[model samples]
Target: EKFVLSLDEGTTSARAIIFDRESNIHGIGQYEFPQHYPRPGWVEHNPEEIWDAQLRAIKDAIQSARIEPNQIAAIGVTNQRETTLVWDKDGKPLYNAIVWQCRRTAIKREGTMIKEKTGLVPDAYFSASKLKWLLDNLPGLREKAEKGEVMFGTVDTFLIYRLTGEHVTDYSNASRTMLFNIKKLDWDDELLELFDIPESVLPEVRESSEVYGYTKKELLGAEIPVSGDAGDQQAALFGEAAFEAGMVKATYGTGSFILVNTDEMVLYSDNLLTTIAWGLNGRVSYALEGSIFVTGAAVQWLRDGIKIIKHASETEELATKLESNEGVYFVPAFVGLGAPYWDQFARGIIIGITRGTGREHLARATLEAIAYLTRDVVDEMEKLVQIKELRVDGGATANDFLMQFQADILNRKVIRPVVKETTALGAAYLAGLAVDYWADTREIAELWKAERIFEPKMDEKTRERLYKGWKEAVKRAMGWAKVV
Candidate 1:
């Protein structure tokens, strides 16, 4: 039987998984690298480390699967989107990859036509500003780029270059760079001119599930077709099996991300995002997304920052022990709010604290706040797509209390699949299709098995009152950074 391999490169980790045609993982390897912090609000990852960790993981995964190198039909890649890197023409990174969460380039803001062309907000969270910063700050970078000796790429493009000796990127990953025109499906010349970027440094764009090239024999001991690539979240959406229009999925981690399938419609939200889901068989699908900056991070803050709890897992038991929040609410705006409430000036708020308040109330509120924030995005998604069920995958979904509460708050079913590794599975699916390991996406929907399904348990009267209080708490917290 043929197998597909996925190199899932994350912010701090690299994992390789080998999957068979039946969606079962035959073997896996994982390693986490160091995160560097030179200054507060600055996050960085060594570009060399990312490549090394991925290389190691691939070797380990092959050994773990106990399969011959030629048995693998193809390799797929999914990565943390929008992390920026600049490299020499020979594939040597010039500097550390600037992480998506890093704000080192926040001072360099562009304007509206950027969003118009790319369907993205002009912010440092994307690659364009960080690319601009590299050009402006590094000595001779402009000269090197002008001389056609430099190459700019996101983590995916960099990996593809290393794997196949080709500077190419998939549509899903390219759309996140804020330099590609979502409407025209090419790098925007106007945006390149506007940002002072040399078009020569950009990689050629390709469809997500096509065979870009074969992996070098030195790296894998056999040439395998390198196919199937997408940004991590889009891979999760595909893995979640949200195939039809109006289907939705949310992957909750440090932050909560909610995306709805628009099925070829480039629908934009004033506060949400319009992004390419994937390009397949000469067609592109779109997604409307809302991102909240803080969700599980608040729980980590209780464990790490406040010292209220000794471990993150403890919050689940403590939270479930409490019947309610006891009128306490947490806005989780510690780093500010995003999507549907685009107030970067907002700060975390805690209100209705009384003598009855204790660690349980705080813990419950923390978990509840995540569910609440998810609904904040889900409610907006309803404006366009009438979603009936929400498929969820991510680390935070393991918390039963949170999942149950999430279903109740939205009054919709929350479906968790048997495979928690949906991110990697999505990449595998893409690769399998490119090589005809699977016939089409129609079979993917049947391959998924529902591990658990959560139904709405809370009554409607209580859902509204609790949600109403959350809105009030959020209002008090907006734009609080101003001196006035």
Candidate 2:
């Protein structure tokens, strides 16, 4: 009974999923962790807390599956990208994990060294700046890192170190950091110097699907091969079987990302970003990504922060009760805008709201905001590359209304897979391939089954009108810092 285990370490939760030989989910375990916000716009997670939650999920998953430990053939890890962490040689964390959503370094001006060495903006969203912060602030941390007494890694690399005692990262994960040169396919020394980071602290980069190392037998009670890894959005692309050029996927998580696979050719985007999708064997696959920094997280604010709704499911019902947004438009620039509008100073705003507008209207506007933001990305994507259709996944896709609206807004068919947890599945597929539990890419591709497809239903005039309003809302969202 060969099984592939996937460790999905996300921003808000840690999940372990076991997939049988046929790619069906056998069992799953999930544990949520608290996000630490020490300062405004800053997000963090204690590395030790993450490791503990992951271990608990793994044990619970194996137990729930009623399978012996030896049945697990390999472990694949997919994680939130750009969440930087630095630790000692003995694997002790130097600071709290700097999450991908953190905005501490968002305002760092691009110095000559930054642009000359790295093709990235000096943004706090990337790993390089966060790692630099950790080393600079923690006492004696700089000395230790310089002495090769400490190691740095993204979330996936950290998990690999914890699981298999291997300090390595995949190209997909490495590319998110400003320190990596995608064209060179290696860490850029000039970027390292610019970021004031030492090469010794960084992990070796590897292919996403190759066997990274074997998990320690004592930890899992068996020698499971620790194999595959990729950042969450890219993993979703792979899980959706997007193996060719023009194949695209949009993931709606805390944030939203639209990625179009470009295969081996690196496609630079004027409005989007050129990112490494993943490396397989010895070859690299590139992608064009448009990022929306806030998506479902705005919905989360409605539920938990604002206390407008008791549960997320009620959002659709509430939204439907309202005839329309009632002239309300919410631009959820909570963590700043991304993609076509990379305005770090942008703030969240609710526009055209009247006294007659109620929570239902706000809810509708919130949901509409996500669709509008997605449209912003897809529009840029369509201009940059030809996308026949889009594969959709993530927790937010469960909302049928949102999916239908997304199709209407984009005017393209939005296809959702039967499995919403494609991120974990992608990692599992990679691990299965490495251990011979699965045959090849074709086999994995065959496993993708579409649950439903949403086609455009809105008229061009109405679509144009609504989109125009969204654009105005965005303009209002930006430049709000002065008003406040």
Candidate 3:
């Protein structure tokens, strides 16, 4: 009789998921959008295209659910955060969204100052520098922003504005902008000044679970409450029901994001990012995140770049065919190494290759590289707190070889959920809570179940030998050499 609709706008695709009170998905719709690469380092998406695709997906899901518009309780939104967009005073997008992977601000002089104030690395990946990029290059757009005639927002904010005509954003998305002070939970004035961005152009920050506004009746056939919004990773954290401190989850998409719930306290790491997990009931929860820039992307490279195989599914068979990497290792630093390494100029490399290396060896090494990168993150995490088990999700988790390798390399159990789509599930839960579609997350937690558990099968000796070689390959792949 009731449902929580989730709009999941990711980097490459947009999806709408409809969930019942029992946290089961009743209907879903998805559509992929084109990615724009005008230059070697530029990544962009037409704001209009993203919105249009998402709207169509939402309509398709609602129709597929076979439910009247009135039966849907509220809408929850989770999106690829840090994809920045600016629009004129009337909600017209000035240009395509400057994607998170775009590297226009890689060489900024304000890195240290921005990091100190915002608890972020001050990289081009965050919204602050991207927003700066827009203001600096858009020709007099800075003057418009200064006059408060332009509004800035991430994907979630843009969607909220389009849905309800409200210019607001959630705390989780706000924190990623590099202008938000994580401690203060507000946009930093100093960061604004340093980045030459004005405060007037920013969205009003709000709680993640409160009712933001109602959707236009013409759009959804009924005025639905457009409530509950968070960044995709934070939404997944909620969806996994990792409500307690020390609970962690890793999403292995193009990159791997490992976020550990730290509750109210923010723990800084030399290589990890301290982020706002979400804002609920006007209180903030913090998380420590280790962002691995390339994971499944390396597999894509193996398929598309090297043309080793015709399809991604073939990788599992090819990798398991080889008993070992056979002295081959792949450090996929294609766009530079992230986290602890922080090497901007590092490139991908396949080291330890001999005449004996075959297709199987290369395939196995590519898969193992993902597991090795995961270990890099956990190794850093071990110094701060104990990671008892690894909760995993995303398209890559479907590869049994990689999951087993991940368990073997880390010597820990890798748990896969019954619901593989936790990112969208998290968005659904956040929306349901807003409208009291269910009680607290206690009810939602009961709905989570593990579909499979991968246990370490490799001996310590073999695991150590494989991982030691992986480290050497990583060193070789650093900015020292250009693999491309």
Q: Which candidate is the best by lDDT?
A: 1
Output the better candidate (1/3) by lDDT: 1
**Candidate with more favorable, higher TM-score: 1 or 3:** 1
| lDDT string, candidate 2, 212-253, tens digits | 888778998998899999998888898888888888898887
Off by over 4 Å in 3: 107-110, 322-327, 344-357, 458-462, 479-484
lDDT for model 2, please: 0.85
lDDT of candidate 3 over 247-282, digit per residue (tens): 778899788899878879777777888889899887
Clashing pairs in 1: none
**TM-score of each model, paired residue for residue:** 0.94, 0.89, 0.92
Task: Quantify all predictions' global Cα lDDT against the true fold.
Answer: 0.88, 0.85, 0.86
RMSD (Å) of each candidate, 1 decimal: 2.1, 3.0, 2.5
Q: Count the backbone clashes (under 3 Å) in each candidate.
A: 0, 0, 0
